[PDB]
Each structure stands twice: as structure tokens, then as C-alpha cells.
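Translate structure to sequence.
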């Protein structure tokens, strides 16, 4: 329904956890979690995490200067229509580790420097219960 967009006054440092709890709606096609490097339209994306129910895949990518990078795909799709979910996106010096439910899902190594991130957005077909930056 209502998407999330918030600024990060301390950015994302190693040891920062983004926790997203919500529910994939019955009619979901896809939704996204972005870690962006600016407020402006078309800012670079250090992380684009994109569960796609319509095409049965979870895509990870980065975006620089308006261009999407190399797509990575996670193993299987740990999201289903109508079902609650919990995602941790955990930053370290080496990359982002996505935890879905009770299982480590995918390790997305940094393409852009982590220190560039200063916005998080969550949107698309998703009902959010809570978005927290720890």
C-alpha cells in the first residue's frame, strides 16, 4: 500500500541491519528494496533487491549512471503470494547478506562503495508491517 522511503544520516556502516517485515499481497507481481546513493531521481543504487513473483525469481543488481549492472539471482524464491515475510539485509565490509525467514539466502558483494548509500526505499507490490534500520 504505502511505500517506505527514508534518509540515512549515518549511512549504512558495516554492522548495519535493515529489517523488513511485511506480507506479499495476494495479487503481487514484484517488489523492491533499494539502497540508493542520493535523493534525486535516478540516483545510483548500491543494492536493488527485487523479489519477482510474476517471473519466479529474486534479482539482485546495482545501478550506476542510469545503467543496471550484472544481474545476480538468488537460489529459488522464498516469497509467496499472501504470505508474511521477514528480510534482513546485513551490511559488512564485503557485501550485503540477505536473510529471508530463518535462512541465509544470498550474499551480494559490493559493486559501489558502501559509504555512498544514504537512502532506503521499499515499494512495489508489498504490504509493510515495519521497516527498521539498526
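Result:
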Amino acid at each position: 500500500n504505502v511505500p517506505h522511503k527514508s534518509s540515512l544520516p549515518e549511512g549504512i556502516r558495516p554492522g548495519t541491519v535493515l529489517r523488513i517485515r511485511g506480507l506479499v499481497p495476494p495479487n503481487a507481481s514484484r517488489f523492491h528494496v533499494n539502497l540508493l546513493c542520493g535523493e534525486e531521481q535516478g540516483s545510483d543504487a548500491a543494492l536493488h533487491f527485487n523479489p519477482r513473483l510474476d517471473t519466479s525469481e529474486v534479482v539482485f543488481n546495482s545501478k550506476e549512471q542510469g545503467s543496471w549492472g550484472r544481474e545476480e539471482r538468488g537460489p529459488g524464491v522464498p516469497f509467496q503470494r499472501g504470505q508474511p515475510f521477514e528480510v534482513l539485509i546485513i551490511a559488512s565490509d564485503d557485501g550485503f547478506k540477505a536473510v529471508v525467514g530463518d535462512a541465509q539466502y544470498h550474499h551480494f558483494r559490493h559493486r559501489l562503495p558502501l559509504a555512498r548509500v544514504r537512502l532506503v526505499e521499499v515499494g512495489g507490490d508489498v504490504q509493510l508491517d515495519s521497516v527498521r534500520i539498526f
